[PDB]
Amino acid sequence: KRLKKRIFAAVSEGCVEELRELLQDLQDLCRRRRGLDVPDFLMHKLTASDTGKTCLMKALLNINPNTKEIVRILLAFAEENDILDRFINAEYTEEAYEGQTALNIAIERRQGDITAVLIAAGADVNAHAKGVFFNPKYQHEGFYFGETPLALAACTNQPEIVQLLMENEQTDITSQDSRGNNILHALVTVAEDFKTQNDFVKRMYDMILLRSGNWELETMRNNDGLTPLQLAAKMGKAEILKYILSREIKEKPLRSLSRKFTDWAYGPVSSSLYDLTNVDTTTDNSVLEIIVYNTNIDNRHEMLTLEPLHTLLHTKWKKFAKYMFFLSFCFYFFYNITLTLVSYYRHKMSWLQLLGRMFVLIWATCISVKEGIAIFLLQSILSDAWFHFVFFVQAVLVILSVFLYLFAYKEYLACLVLAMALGWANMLAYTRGFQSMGMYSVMIQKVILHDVLKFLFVYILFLLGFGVALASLIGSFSDAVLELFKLTIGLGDLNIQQNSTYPILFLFLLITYVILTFVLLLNMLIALMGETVENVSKESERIWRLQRARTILEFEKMLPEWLRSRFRMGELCKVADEDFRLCLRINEVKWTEWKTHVSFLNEDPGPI
Amino acid sequence: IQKVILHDVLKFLFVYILFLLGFGVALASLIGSFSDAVLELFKLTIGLGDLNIQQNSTYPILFLFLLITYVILTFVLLLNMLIALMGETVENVSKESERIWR
Amino acid sequence: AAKMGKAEILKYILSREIKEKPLRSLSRKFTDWAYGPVSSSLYDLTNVDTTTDNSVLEIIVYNTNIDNRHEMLTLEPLHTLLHTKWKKFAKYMFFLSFCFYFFYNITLTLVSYYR
Amino acid sequence: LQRARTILEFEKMLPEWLRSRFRMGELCKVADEDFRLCLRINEVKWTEWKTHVSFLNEDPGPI
Ligand SMILES: COc1ccc2ccc(=O)oc2c1CC=C(C)C
Ligand SMILES: COc1ccc2ccc(=O)oc2c1CC=C(C)C
Ligand SMILES: COc1ccc2ccc(=O)oc2c1CC=C(C)C
Numbered sequence: 030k031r032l033k034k035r036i037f038a039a040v041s042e043g044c045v046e047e048l049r050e051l052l053q054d055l056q057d058l059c060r061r062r063r064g065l066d067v068p069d070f071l072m073h074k075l076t077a078s079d080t081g082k083t084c085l086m087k088a089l090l091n092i093n094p095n096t097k098e099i100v101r102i103l104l105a106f107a108e109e110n111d112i113l114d115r116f117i118n119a120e121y122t123e124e125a126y127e128g129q130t131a132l133n134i135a136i137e138r139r140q141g142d143i144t145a146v147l148i149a150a151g152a153d154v155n156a157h158a159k160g161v162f163f164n165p166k167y168q169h170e171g172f173y174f175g176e177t178p179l180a181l182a183a184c185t186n187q188p189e190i191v192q193l194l195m196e197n198e199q200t201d202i203t204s205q206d207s208r209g210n211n212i213l214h215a216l217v218t219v220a221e222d223f224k225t226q227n228d229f230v231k232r233m234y235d236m237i238l239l240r241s242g243n244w245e246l247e248t249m250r251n252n253d254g255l256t257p258l259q260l261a262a263k264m265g266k267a268e269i270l271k272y273i274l275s276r277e278i279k280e281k282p283l284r285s286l287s288r289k290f291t292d293w294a295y296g297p298v299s300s301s302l303y304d305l306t307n308v309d310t311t312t313d314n315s316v317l318e319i320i321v322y323n324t325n326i327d328n329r330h331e332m333l334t335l336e337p338l339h340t341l342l343h344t345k346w347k348k349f350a351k352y353m354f355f356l357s358f359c360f361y362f363f364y365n366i367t368l369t370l371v372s373y374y375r376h377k378m379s380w381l382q383l384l385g386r387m388f389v390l391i392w393a394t395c396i397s398v399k400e401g402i403a404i405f406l407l408q409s410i411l412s413d414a415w416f417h418f419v420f421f422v423q424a425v426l427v428i429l430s431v432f433l434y435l436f437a438y439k440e441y442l443a444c445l446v447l448a449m450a451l452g453w454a455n456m457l458a459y460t461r462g463f464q465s466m467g468m469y470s471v472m473i474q475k476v477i478l479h480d481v482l483k484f485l486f487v488y489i490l491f492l493l494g495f496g497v498a499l500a501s502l503i504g505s506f507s508d509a510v511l512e513l514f515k516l517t518i519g520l521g522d523l524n525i526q527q528n529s530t531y532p533i534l535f536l537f538l539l540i541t542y543v544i545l546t547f548v549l550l551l552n553m554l555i556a557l558m559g560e561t562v563e564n565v566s567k568e569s570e571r572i573w574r575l576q577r578a579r580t581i582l583e584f585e586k587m588l589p590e591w592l593r594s595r596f597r598m599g600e601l602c603k604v605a606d607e608d609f610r611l612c613l614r615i616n617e618v619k620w621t622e623w624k625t626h627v628s629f630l631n632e633d634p635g636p637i
Numbered sequence: 638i639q640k641v642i643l644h645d646v647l648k649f650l651f652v653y654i655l656f657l658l659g660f661g662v663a664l665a666s667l668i669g670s671f672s673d674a675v676l677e678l679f680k681l682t683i684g685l686g687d688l689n690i691q692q693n694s695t696y697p698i699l700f701l702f703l704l705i706t707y708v709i710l711t712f713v714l715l716l717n718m719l720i721a722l723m724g725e726t727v728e729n730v731s732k733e734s735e736r737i738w739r
Numbered sequence: 740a741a742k743m744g745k746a747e748i749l750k751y752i753l754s755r756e757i758k759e760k761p762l763r764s765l766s767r768k769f770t771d772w773a774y775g776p777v778s779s780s781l782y783d784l785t786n787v788d789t790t791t792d793n794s795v796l797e798i799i800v801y802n803t804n805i806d807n808r809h810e811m812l813t814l815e816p817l818h819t820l821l822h823t824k825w826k827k828f829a830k831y832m833f834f835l836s837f838c839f840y841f842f843y844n845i846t847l848t849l850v851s852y853y854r
Numbered sequence: 855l856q857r858a859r860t861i862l863e864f865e866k867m868l869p870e871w872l873r874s875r876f877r878m879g880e881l882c883k884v885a886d887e888d889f890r891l892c893l894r895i896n897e898v899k900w901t902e903w904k905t906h907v908s909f910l911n912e913d914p915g916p917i
């Protein structure tokens with residue numbers, strides 16, 4: 030048993046001669062074991078039974094410059110012993126690291142020739158790794174490359190290994206794994222910005238894709254049920270998503286697997302067709318929908334700047350929602366006027382007094398029904414869900430107050446005033462929907478209610494400290510609050526200063542409160558400017574790009590299907606043989622670079 | 638910047654006058670008197686209204702609420718247009734001034 | 740290094756690791772394990788932590804005369820260890836001290852003459 | 855500063871036996887005849903790429 034560990038030590042070192050003679054000793058052990066015929070006696074002596082690690086495994090852990098000689102001897106030892114398939118394709122037995130198959134290790138240790146010999150040995154190169162480490166619940170715990178030796182070298186930027194694994198016979202590029210992912214998913218899953226990662230995730234996405242040659246291995250969906258394009262949306266990885274939409278290929282026999290088809294070019298002017306296979310909302314899950322209806326990811330302002338999203342989003346405003354938002358704006362504007370006039374300022378022939386109150390009741394319900402479902406469908410109060418709360422609350426209190434008049438409880442009038450009060454509050458809520466005027470204010474209403482109230486929570490507590498102090502100078506306590514609030518106004522004067530007890534002490538506590546208020550009110554004035562400059566100033570139009578585009582698709586589901594069927598952007602076009610696609614046309618002009626053109630949708634440039 | 642300050646302050650004032658008349662009909666419901674309620678609430682911007690006019694006939698607890706909500710929100714809004722004019726009109730209107738001067 | 744407050748040398752002390760085998764003992768920031776792009780490390784705590792009467796962290800705190808204390812605390816074995824001591828002790832300790840003195844001021848003003 | 859000032863100021867206020875429970879880091883062996891209390895921090899790098907030869911352990915994950 031010491032002899033086994035001495036081998037593991039000889040595994041751990043480059044002692045070539047010491048490694049050889051122990052195998053000569055182990056060969057003599059196999060000779061003396063006649064009855065076993067050494068199937069597993071070879072296995073038992075070369076492997077710790079608790080962990081499943083072998084001699085070839087542990088040698089690939091510890092890399093020395095004598096490692097290549099260790100490999101060629103270990104493979105020479107197994108081949109007389111005829112158990113190399115059992116030897117090389119051994120795997121881990123514990124639930125962590127589960128089935129690692131140290132061909133995986135040599136990829137991770139980046140040894141190309143050592144990898145080539147194991148391929149030349151034949152090592153089941155589509156070996157699915159498992160284990161809690163390879164599929165971690167947390168980011169700090171493990172590393173999720175997607176359980177594939179091919180995808181590992183892809184994820185670890187070793188393109189020659191990606192090249193060398195590419196032309197094996199039983200490679201099976203289309204493989205799936207635990208969590209249901211394909212090789213492109215993990216490439217999306219493991220990606221960052223141009224900071225901290227430089228374009229290899231893009232390029233290794235490209236390099237494997239040219240070998241593919243089929244629309245499948247993008248049409249596949251995971252166990253979550255998502256395409257790599259869909260998973261690009263849900264993960265929100267921006268830099269890969271730019272590459273997907275503008276993926277064009279000049280090289281002829283596989284120009285089919287391409288997007289952004291070049292329509293025509295005539296010198297500095299060209300036109301192009303961006304594909305709409307799954308971007309537009311004609312399908313239940315679309316690219317544009319997932320980017321809108323998620324708050325948890327990040328960075329939604331960046332992704333919407335990208336081109337086939339950006340123009341298509343602009344067109345849907347122009348043909349639908351600029352009419353739709355202005356119409357919704359005018360109806361609720363008439364609704365608030367309809368509330369306040371017939372409150373008490375104004376029943377047989379008086380039709381328009383009665384039909385006016387009827388018009389209030391019918392429209393407030395449909396808002397309350399639609400918002401009541403929508404709130405029940407769903408973090409939230411930071412953006413737009415607190416707003417959709419107030420629309421529902423204001424609608425109910427209109428309905429609730431009139432129903433108090435039916436049961437004649439006297440608070441029907443008082444609840445009616447609160448309903449009309451919040452009716453103008455939601456009238457302020459449409460002011461963000463203009464391009465400019467609400468949006469610098471509304472997102473800073475998020476900020477100015479935060480920063481001034483924390484000053485006011487100081488200041489009201491700063492108020493009541495001085496208030497009980499002067500009340501001790503001889504409800505009168507509530508009157509002392511009202512007296513000291515006049516000092517903020519300036520209404521208190523010299524004659525009220527003529528105290529009964531200690532005029533010298535009463536003269537001190539006044540002027541200390543005056544100056545410190547001038548200290549504090551100047552301080553929040555200064556500190557708001559230095560903090561909210563250029564950060565809240567930019568984040569304002571960020572949410573303006575959000576909450577507009579939020580509502581645009583929210584208007585889109587409100588339209589009927591037959592009227593949607595008229596308004597379909599883009600057009601059915603033929604980019605290749607036996608293919609017909611709806612695509613979006615965008616004209617543009619470049620001047621800087623200059624190239625002759627070989628890829629054409631048409632010969633004739635102009636619109637026919 | 639008279640081109641600019643008439644644009645940016647009036648859109649605040651078109652909010653604020655509409656922000657005025659919403660509170661104006663609310664306190665008028667607390668018992669032309671409607672035009673007098675505008676003149677009463679404009680005194681609050683001046684500071685002329687005081688404690689004795691607060692002694693309402695109906696619901697003093699509700700009349701105490703609608704005053705102080707208008708005071709703070711006015712201090713919110715008038716501070717907001719003060720901040721937003723500085724961050725927007727810096728260095729762009731400041732350069733475009735001498736452009737038109739040329 | 741702490742008392743003089745020389746920052747640039749102090750970064751070299753804490754992350755002083757050596758790959759060269761026969762003297763890898765005289766090293767700090769021991770590499771735990773690495774698997775591709777993910778690695779773990781062990782920063783030593785020979786004299787940094789306050790288990791000894793004079794420690795590195797103590798001298799950086801309890802001096803005003805030197806300079807530049809914001810720079811030195813950005814350094815790594817200080818920075819994480821300082822963050823952990825907030826989380827396991829002082830966020831409970833400061834909030835508890837905050838609530839007692841908050842109750843204390845209310846306890847002062849009420850029984851002044853109101854009751 | 856003043857946060858981290860008070861943190862160590864709270865530290866001396868604690869008793870020794872309760873401090874003895876809360877000891878950050880762990881006793882580990884980095885070399886022969888050496889045992890040290892050290893702090894573990896995980897991190898991720900992408901830019902440079904090197905094969906690894908210096909190891910505390912062969913097995914990456916927490917056991
Ligand atoms: C009005 O159309 C919209 C609407 C929303 C967004 C949101 C993000 C964005 O970056 O772009 C957008 C556009 C395009 C604007 C123009 C001037 C072509
Ligand atoms: C165009 O109609 C609109 C417009 C705007 C809104 C705003 C919020 C909302 O929840 O509902 C709305 C509706 C639906 C009302 C009807 C009568 C179908
Ligand atoms: C709350 O933990 C603290 C406390 C104090 C300091 C002081 C200096 C410093 O630069 O870093 C600090 C941290 C670390 C914060 C995080 C979020 C890891």
Ligand SMILES: COc1ccc2ccc(=O)oc2c1CC=C(C)C
Pocket residue numbers: 836
């Ligand atoms: C946790 O206890 C606290 C909390 C906060 C402070 C603040 C300043 C101070 O000088 O002393 C303090 C103490 C010690 C009091 C006791 C009863 C042991």
